[PDB]
């Protein structure tokens, strides 16, 4: 109904979005956010794709968000040799796009408040369920028909649910860390091709850069905390970059590279899985609180946004019965949120075994070959996760099946070539 | 050295054992047990080489071994009534049945045998730090207390580990498997053991499994494993009987025809939880052992055994490195995590395998096969159960050797098979 009351823990990306969806069902939605309001007072800028945009569209916020973001119509792949090689993102209609964490969070919090039946309570944190006010130890919690945990990867709500029975949970800090470095404008234009995801794929080290609107790119650098150990000196940084990423040094400030590198230390990436996502129609997790995935497919925000949407579809489908919706969310969504978590991890692993200048290209071009050969039966993985709402686990199934039929189908051509050689050679 | 204070959280199997080991190198050791003294106020488990070696280290092997029943073989109850006994590898090598309780009581008492040790019953813990907050006999008496070492031996649901979990770079995972477990008892018949008293008795259905271990009165205690699902489908005495008739037909005579009823409805199926984490320490002030560090699913009889080996390996390190906890805590994590993850894995593998590929028969084949090849090549092939039960081959190496073996067999006999045919 309308006059049930729901509290959203977290005024983040997902928290805000959810509060919009819920406000839009005429719920009374109170959003509690630890930090002070970011419009007055982790990733700097992220990749927004079909799934997230479809969630944004259900609240009539897609157009606003899309207008502040720069399109990425292709990958641009920076070889060690200096060779820049550019592969488009699937079809001509499909592109991912680069937006800013904060512009996104800000517009969303504003959208939250635009619903008169919704408040957002900045400077409120949470200890048990016990929300704090402005002054700490002002424990003035207050009850609700739904508590929605959108408190992110280090989730308080999840922490309570983890103590409950038959709750599987896991948390892995991976070997690599990330740190942000910014490419500026060169004479007031973009120093690189600005409608491209820029990748510098080495194996143990990888860099990406995503265009902003002030004509800059922000780059994240990934490498094992091991190598972060090995560059304590400005000379080392320089030497490293000269070795592994030659064309960055000119692109980035040669000297600002050193201010920005040592500005604060490499960030850890956590992976948390859990099951199930809910508790007896009084409590549910969503986004990074439910799944926190290593940032290796551009899908963490997209998936958490999609949680919000999938929920909202179940609230339509089951006329707002939380006792139905909460177990159904967990049944329907956990497979997918786990599968994207796996995809993300697979990718990260793959990217340290073998992706160099060269492999990236072969892998994608081969993918493009086979789609062009046999559409629809082969759709590349990237297309499936980035440009559709095919369920993630299904996309994994299809992606395995496809790889099975490419391997089996290659074998017979290899062997028919192998008999064809000998028969034409003898006679 | 003598000046150092240590607290052991939990006065369980591992906690009490560790407290001995520590007391025995002159620490000031205080054990804090949330329960009341079980000596005044898994019922029974499978002791083996690893545990016995740790027990030996502290002068308590003999005391414990006196009160247990040797199980010199497996005894396999097939659905038809057939009962095949496969021996444990060697006449010297047997596993033995003991009580959780008697074991826990003798260790508590041995802890108290040392003048520099105290155990503090009815004391629970709230919060700790690298200053801890233990509860008194009266709830809400939160007195602080300090120490040079805090050893988390507080079990599968470990308070101390909950604190480590919050710290950075700390990997942790919990998984409750589908099956729970229930204890049942085969009494004595006419004052004697109702079955061969020196076997581990196994009834391997797939979705349902059951084992039985002798006690010293002339009974066996059984554990029944099945999916919590099936447990839900047996609410009445009739259903339990009707089930037992289907899956474990020889039991209804063996077990009290209605002792079964008393015991099955005595209290609900208990869940089995796998927990894994890394690392096992926090920078020389704090260390996890036994189930706090590794709760494994109970399908290799190794849980207590590994936890006891933890205590032994810590002692070995404290010897090697002259009691430097700055060195031993990281070295413990470094040396022991691979092994303690390995046995966790072995345990779970075993448990999945026992839901698909062991009916009555595969158990015999697999074991007999394995026995054949040991006899053929006593050094290059040692069977799995022998390596875990009867040696201190490190768990991870045992899994290596084991995989290697499986490969040389698969390759070598696929060579005989495919080439000569
Ligand atoms: C390096 C990196 C790159 C990434 N790149 C991409 C990308 O390209 N594309 C993409 O889709 N995703 C990306 N992601 C994923 C994305 O950052 C997250 O998935 C997304 O922020 C999840 O939103 P959320 O609201 O669940 O968590 P958050 O956005 O972190 O929000 C959590 C909010 O809850 C608040 N909070 C925490 N605790 C409490 C409490 N006790 N009480 C009240 N409030 C609390 C916090 O203050 C915060 O505002 C990336 C992540 C990283 C780390
Ligand atoms: C069905 C089953 C069969 C098993 N069979 C075998 C087998 O055949 N062989 C084998 O080797 N192992 C077996 N195990 C494993 C064995 O039971 C455990 O390995 C062993 O009990 C772990 O010892 P521990 O001292 O770490 O944990 P526990 O023995 O559980 O000790 C934890 C202790 O700490 C106390 N405590 C907990 N929290 C606090 C707190 N906050 N403050 C103070 N005190 C606290 C608890 O009261 C308890 O006494 C089996 C387990 C199960 C469930
Ligand atoms: C932020 C964002 C948005 N999309 N992607 C992304 C991720 C992975 C991809 O596959 C890599 C691969 C191709 C072929 C073989 C193995 C791996 C592709 C792709 O297909 O272009 C695109 C990222 C991203 C994030 C971090 C790193 Cl390190 C990175 F390279 C890219
Ligand atoms: C308490 C205790 C002590 N040892 N074991 C044990 C465990 C596993 C074993 O391997 C099984 C297997 C044999 C052959 C092939 C696959 C698997 C063997 C063995 O080889 O005898 C013995 C148990 C135990 C615990 C739970 C169950 Cl369910 C169980 F059956 C026995
Ligand atoms: Cl991500
Ligand atoms: Cl066990």
Numbering used by the authors:
A (entry chain A): 6 to 46, 52 to 139, 146 to 443
B (entry chain B): 6 to 46, 53 to 141, 144 to 434
Task: Please share text taken word for word from the publication where this structure appeared.
We determined the full-length structure of Rat-KMO in its membrane-embedded form complexed with compound 3 and compound 4 at 3.0 Å resolution. Unexpectedly, the crystal structure showed that the C-terminal region was comprising only one transmembrane domain, with the other predicted transmembrane helix lying laterally along the membrane. The KMO monomers are linked by intermolecular β-sheets at F183-Y189 (β12), strongly suggesting physiological dimerisation.
The ligand-binding pocket of the full-length Rat-KMO was composed not only of residues from the FAD-binding domain but also of residues from the C-terminal region. Compound 3 was recognised by hydrogen bonds on one side by residues R85, Y99, R380 and Y398. No strong contacts between FAD and compound 3 were observed. Five residues in the C-terminal region starting from K380 differed from that in Rat-KMO.
